[PDB]
Amino acid sequence: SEMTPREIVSELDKHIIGQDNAKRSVAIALRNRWRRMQLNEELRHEVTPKNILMIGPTGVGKTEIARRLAKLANAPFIKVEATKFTEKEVDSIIRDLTDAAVKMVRVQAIEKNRYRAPSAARQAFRKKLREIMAPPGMEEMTSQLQSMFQNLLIEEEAAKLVNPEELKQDAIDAVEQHGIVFIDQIDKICKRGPDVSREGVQRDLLPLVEGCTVSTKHGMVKTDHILFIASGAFQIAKPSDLIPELQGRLPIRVELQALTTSDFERILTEPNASITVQYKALMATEGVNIEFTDSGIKRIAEAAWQVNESTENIGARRLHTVLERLMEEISYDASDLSGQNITIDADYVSKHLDALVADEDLSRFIL
Amino acid sequence: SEMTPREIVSELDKHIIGQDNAKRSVAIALRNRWRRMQLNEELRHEVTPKNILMIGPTGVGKTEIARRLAKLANAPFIKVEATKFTEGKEVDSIIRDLTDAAVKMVRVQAIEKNRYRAEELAEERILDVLIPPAEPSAARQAFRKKLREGQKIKDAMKLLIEEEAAKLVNPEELKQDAIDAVEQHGIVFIDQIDKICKSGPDVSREGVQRDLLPLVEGCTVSTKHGMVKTDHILFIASGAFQIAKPSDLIPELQGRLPIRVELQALTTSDFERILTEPNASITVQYKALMATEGVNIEFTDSGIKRIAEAAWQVNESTENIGARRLHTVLERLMEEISYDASDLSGQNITIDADYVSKHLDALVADEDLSRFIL
Amino acid sequence: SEMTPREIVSELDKHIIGQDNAKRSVAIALRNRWRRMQLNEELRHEVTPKNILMIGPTGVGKTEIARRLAKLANAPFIKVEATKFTEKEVDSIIRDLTDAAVKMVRVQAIEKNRYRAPSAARQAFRKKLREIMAPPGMEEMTSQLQSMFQNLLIEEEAAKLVNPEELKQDAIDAVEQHGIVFIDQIDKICKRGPDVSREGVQRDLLPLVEGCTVSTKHGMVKTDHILFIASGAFQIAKPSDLIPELQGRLPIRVELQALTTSDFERILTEPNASITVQYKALMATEGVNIEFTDSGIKRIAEAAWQVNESTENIGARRLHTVLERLMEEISYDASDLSGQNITIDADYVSKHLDALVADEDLSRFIL
Amino acid sequence: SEMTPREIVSELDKHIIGQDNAKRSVAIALRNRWRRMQLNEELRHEVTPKNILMIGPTGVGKTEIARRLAKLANAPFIKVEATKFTEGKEVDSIIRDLTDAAVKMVRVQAIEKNRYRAEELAEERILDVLIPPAEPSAARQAFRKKLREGQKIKDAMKLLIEEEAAKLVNPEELKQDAIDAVEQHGIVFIDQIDKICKSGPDVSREGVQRDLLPLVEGCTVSTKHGMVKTDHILFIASGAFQIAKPSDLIPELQGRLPIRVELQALTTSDFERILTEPNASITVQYKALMATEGVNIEFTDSGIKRIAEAAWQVNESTENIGARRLHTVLERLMEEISYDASDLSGQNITIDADYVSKHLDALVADEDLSRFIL
Amino acid sequence: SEMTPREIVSELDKHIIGQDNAKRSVAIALRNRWRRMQLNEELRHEVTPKNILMIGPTGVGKTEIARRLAKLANAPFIKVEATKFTEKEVDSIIRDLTDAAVKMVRVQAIEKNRYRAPSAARQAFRKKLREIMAPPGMEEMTSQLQSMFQNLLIEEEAAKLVNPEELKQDAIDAVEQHGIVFIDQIDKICKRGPDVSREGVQRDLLPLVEGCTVSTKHGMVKTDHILFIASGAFQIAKPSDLIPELQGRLPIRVELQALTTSDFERILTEPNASITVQYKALMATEGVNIEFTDSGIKRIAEAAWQVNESTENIGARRLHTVLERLMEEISYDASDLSGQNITIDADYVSKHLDALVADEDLSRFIL
Ligand SMILES: Nc1ncnc2c1ncn2[C@@H]1O[C@H](COP(=O)(O)OP(=O)(O)O)[C@@H](O)[C@H]1O
Ligand SMILES: Nc1ncnc2c1ncn2[C@@H]1O[C@H](COP(=O)(O)OP(=O)(O)O)[C@@H](O)[C@H]1O
Ligand SMILES: Nc1ncnc2c1ncn2[C@@H]1O[C@H](COP(=O)(O)OP(=O)(O)O)[C@@H](O)[C@H]1O
Ligand SMILES: Nc1ncnc2c1ncn2[C@@H]1O[C@H](COP(=O)(O)OP(=O)(O)O)[C@@H](O)[C@H]1O
Ligand SMILES: Nc1ncnc2c1ncn2[C@@H]1O[C@H](COP(=O)(O)OP(=O)(O)O)[C@@H](O)[C@H]1O
């Protein structure tokens, strides 16, 4: 895509609220992709992706930026927990990214084949018509062996139209050129002064960012120009605790601000397909019409902020648990309330929540 | 390649700055490869690669020399962290991953030779349906013109490239080429070898050395692409050796590293050179990148001087990461231009010393913030 | 081979310097091989190889004796570090030995097929003419499955002349009859009083020497008559610390003496293809002629002995690091010095080395 | 085999010296196999092998009895160290490795039967090209004579041995024979079982016993060669039992070892017998080996007496390894003759008591040296 | 089978001596099987097997009851040591049970094909006539791959008569309906207050009893209606120490009494194919006739009880070691004693045993 950095941020504002510095940082990395293609043969090999390190408390949108970014560029995407490797091989990151790129380009290939998939009597009828047991590591291998053994109209036409050798070669080029990976909670593999096992994971991840080659059943993939987005609260450790070889491979740094009560009020409504809009369409399925007052949206955001300050701050994720606890009575009766217009006023919010928010011992369970 | 040792160093000077001793040492190893092939049948077996042990602080260009060296020789290359084997994976995976890189290397390079001939015969194939045969016919050329001018039909040209490139390629000559490329030209870089030197960990630390021993003394490893022998593979080990010393390595390993070299720490003056002198230096990279948006950036000598001073202060204020600090500092300076470069099309921007201090000095002043941002 | 023990030692003297007791011991074991074949059917099963245990400091030639011995008998050979199994199965020793025996008999089969590989116009032109992804353990298995899937003029003729069923059956008989294995640093698996894991390796190695059967993709190999050569400094532990079942399986013992300065002077020159001869041929490739004075060879041996006495004694391996440090200037300028005769006198040795040998702190790095 | 228990002991006396109780105990187990086959369908299932537990110091011939016993019965055999499973490998590998030994055993023995008939039909095949058919013809014999006299042609005789031996062999009768050989005749020796007796290690020690339990109580193990049942396999466990006792074994395991026997320690007199009396004794072995070089060695009775005394002193001076000490002492005495035997062809050497003391007493006197050399 | 609970116990009395409460408990579980089949479609899914937990010292017959029970019902059977999983997957229990069910139904299928497997000259002659190397986990997989590669008159007829698709489908129905599993020494995986690894095994076994599905090369097996019989001394821990999810899945509990001297006297003779009867038939093979006096049988039982009270009580298993120690002289001379009638009187028992039983230090080895 040829979108300029401001055009990228403007699209991210349709989903993510605030955190513009993180939006500006990801826009720079995605714009350098298009900038690299316009360069000559020599510079395209020397220039490498400007990988980003997001820093901030949980639930502030570090992942949603990476998700919407890859969804914006139609790029292959995967999220991985860095701690998973403290105990799987690191090369699986590129494998799973390709398997997602395969299904992505494949279902997209069906889209091109879908729409392809007269006598007066011809139009008349046309109008009326309208076992192999293996350990877990090789379970995917025995799958392919079983599919090889089995080998030895929408389905037959789409198979006739599709080019399987093209879809497999394309997904590699979609990964080598446009791929994106998100390494969540990278701060937890930094040295606490386990430090050998923690820093050992950093060394195992190093070739993926330094440019290496990973074999896959779909083909041979190179990790040279893949973009990476690490994230971590970095409250315990600091980015300087990362190994020097890794710090130099994350040229862009950014800190995401903690969300405020006003941000919660915006997140509930402004973003496209916001959670409040979702239940409004859900209750519309039952014939019920729900409407949230601005005071009702205010106290909901006020309720989530209190739980985060009372016990544990989980970020905007607290909005999900609170909203479902508020609408639980409506969602159950929504079948019997068909044809009725329900209003979520400030009194309705205080009725279903203030008794719960007041008891911190209960808030740790119900919310 | 038949390059003489001075020709190797001069090419390395186009990328690496300074560290001439490490350049001279790697040049001797690569020259011994060509010197060996000229020898008789007996001496070619007895002579073994002169493996090198790089020593110095991190980020001084130890790996870059090995990378540019293998790229100069078009040789298979892989960087392996010696600490990966402390936990576990088998050591033989080094040769396995090296061949996989050599497979993709010889394959993509073989596509470069097939990129040309395939288009000719693919044109001859597609012209057989337009002008079926019963000097080129005049209609054979009249269609050949409209084809090159541009035009399932359009999908068919891509399918013939595969069938012709597969017909032109010799897989037994290709999959066996990567084996010849590994056995004859292969190169391996073993980073942070000093950390496996020497009671509990000393057994597991030195155990990794003995697992690595057959690879340098010569052995044979089985791979899915074939059977590879490691007798003539060149190896480059590196380590800071501040906690331990090369003498702490097992004696069988000290004798397999005949060349030793220490790399000097980079100075502020070297940072200024790294920013500009090397071919496709990072400052040149950002210049051509902003050029893509139609902006012309230019760095003043004092502007370059203050970036190197900025990266040096962070390395001294907190942690010294070598010349890697130049990358984090530069993008932090250019982040405002890189975002606005779309709206700044047609303008000539100048990175002066005042601009560098405006965007950086406030950050370098706070060491608490430098650890997070730089 | 029908070589007598003195004929074996005489050939080993062409490579190894001194250490005659170890040369005499290996000659006895190799001669018993030929002696066993002349015996009747009963005694050939009861007699077992006289395995040897070499004892001495590192770098005194314990391995070179085993290497030249197997190279002298054209026998399959492999070196293994006993500590590798403290963390691979022990049966891999026989597998890798066969894979080396296969490549040995195979390239030797090409030698027999190589030389096999008129009209006046006939002689005239004759004159003008002149993806499957698996864990690391089964990577070799998927190789064979991939080679089976692919199955389902020098190359075509050598394949037409060779007998693949013969080469595979021969390599087994070459292993079962003439095979040799070298177990380096066996002293490190003795009990230090880990002792369970150390002695556990001794128990795992026991069936290989007591006569057992190991399966291999090339075939079923028996370890009855394979010769073994263990080695260890035995400075910490002693051979009596080995398990009793293992001590009885090593009937021959020998101690290799520490090399002296005079031995270094001999090792540099006397052995065939000595290291000094190697660089002389290497510098001859550049058109340069190097010549070492007897005083120059003396001070080189004197230099290596000082480093071994100053910090750590690595045996004759110190000669390699010292010599390359001395010739580093010549090896770099050898291109520009074409047609010149360079002499390595005693002054040249003292110029490039005495400054380094004097500083022990630097000798631990550069040498 | 239908050998009676006394016939078994008498054959074991040809190899093992003394230890008659262990010979009588193993003979009862092997005789019960033949006794079971004579029984009806019901009793053959209910009766199970009388497993034996050998007890005594190392090197007294516990394993040799089990080896000669299985070799006497031509039965599959394997020795497994019980401590191997403390770390890990599965216990079922015992039956897997046993079948692999039984596969090679029945295969090489099947080659012995095919060694004969194949040569006859291979001759009939090669005579068809010399005298193509349109009582043996006179030319059929005239070529058969020149063939047996000796002579691709020479390579062809080897290829027909494979095709005929493969045609003569019945693989379903062979690969299934090794299964019958394991199930009906299989024997397993479990060395040092006393070391897995009984808090931390006691769970892992006794855990191995419970993993071994299904093999003796009866079970079924899957192998690549087939499906094997362990109900009728004989087992022989051994251990010094100085740290622990057989009562320390798990109760389900004590009941599966109905026969118990203690092996006495070997004396100096027994060493003298071991050197000479057993068939193909080591002294006989060195005699026939020096014979190959054309030397005739002869050991005096006092010379044999002083070798046994030499091995005994080392076992008492340092570590007692049993009769294994005889091997290390003997070769150390014969190492000078074994090297010179080529030049000594045609001479009669005599190993007297003076010769034994000349080469050994200096070594036995220094206990510091005996640990390294003997 | 339609056997009533008393008919089951009456058959168990032919092998097991006493312990009637355990015989009554297993009879109830086997009778509920037949009772479930007579129920309607709904109740057959809701009713689940009444699993039993046997409690008592070792060697009192806890396993023989389970063995004879499965042999009585011709059901597939397997015994497993719960401690084996403290270090194999638990799903292997169902796999090995099916492999035993396959061989069971297969050899039973040969029985149906066995009996199927005229001119005067016809009756006359009729009268005169009368390499792939894998780690241990996938060794069974490579077996099937090797058998697939090989694929690509009693034997040919039985193969022609048998229905291989029927034998594989039947063994699953034989497991899903009639299967039985015995988990020995379940008391050792209870918490001692390892407790995580011990109770972790209890959680891994839970789905097998709670009704789950286990894949197998023979087919997909369901563990819903499989009967299970756990056993343990429960001297250290108690059944209440088991996890609550497991206690509810063992509705039947029973304690097996310690065997007395009188029971040993009965076990030696009364059970069908008793050990004394076995040696009588064994010595009959040698032409010898052995006969045990009631006083001889008495002192044998008295001897075994003394060893159990002196050192360690192994239950009725002590009878095996004692009897073989008594008959060792006869079993060796039985060949030379052909045609003789030997009597095992009380004096014969005291002669061969009292010297051994008196020495407790020797009893720990010989007996
Ligand atoms: N700025 C924001 N705008 C809109 N939604 C947000 C924002 N920040 C957080 N959220 C919501 O909260 C959740 C944040 O989770 P996530 O971004 O995965 O955590 P983190 O940011 O710690 O990686 C998302 O489900 C998202 O819908
Ligand atoms: N002499 C040099 N010339 C140019 N760039 C350098 C030099 N030394 C270091 N760099 C830069 O700093 C980084 C050094 O990292 P690397 O060489 O991998 O570390 P090490 O030298 O410790 O192995 C590289 O990204 C490289 O671009
Ligand atoms: N007696 C000798 N004669 C010739 N070269 C020797 C001798 N001893 C050692 N060397 C040299 O030193 C090295 C010895 O290493 P090696 O024999 O593998 O160590 P070790 O003897 O401890 O096993 C060899 O490369 C060999 O060239
Ligand atoms: N009674 C004996 N007769 C002959 N040789 C014996 C005897 N006892 C021991 N040996 C010799 O000593 C060694 C004993 O080792 P082994 O029997 O395996 O040990 P263990 O008896 O402890 O299992 C064998 O090599 C054997 O040749
Ligand atoms: N009541 C009994 N009747 C007959 N034999 C018994 C009885 N109890 C024990 N036995 C014998 O003792 C042994 C008991 O072992 P087992 O039942 O497996 O131990 P546990 O009962 O502890 O599981 C069996 O071999 C059996 O022959």
Author numbering:
A (entry chain F), C (entry chain F), E (entry chain F): 2 to 88, 94 to 123, 152 to 164, 185 to 206, 225 to 265, 270 to 443
B (entry chain E), D (entry chain E): 2 to 88, 93 to 139, 151 to 167, 217 to 263, 268 to 443
Quote the original article.
ATP-dependent proteolysis requires HslU6 to bind the degrons of target proteins in its axial channel and then unfold and translocate the substrate into the proteolytic chamber of HslV12. Here, we present evidence for a model in which HslU hexamers are autoinhibited at low temperatures by a trimeric I-domain plug that blocks the axial channel but melts at high temperatures to activate proteolysis.
We determined structures for three new crystal forms of E. coli HslU or HslUV by molecular replacement. Our new structures were similar to previous ones with the notable exception that a trimeric plug, formed by residues 183–206 of the I-domain, completely blocked the axial channel of the HslU ring. The plug consisted of amino acids from three of the six HslU subunits, each comprising an extended region (residues 183–188), a sharp turn (residues 189–191), and an α helix (residues 192–206). Additional hydrophobic packing contacts within the plug included Val184 and Ile186 from the extended region, which occupy peripheral grooves between plug helices, and Met202 from the helix. A Pro189-Pro190-Gly191 tripeptide formed a sharp turn between the extended region and α helix of the plug. Because protein substrates must access the axial channel of HslU to be engaged, unfolded, and translocated into the peptidase chamber of HslV, this plug would inhibit substrate degradation.
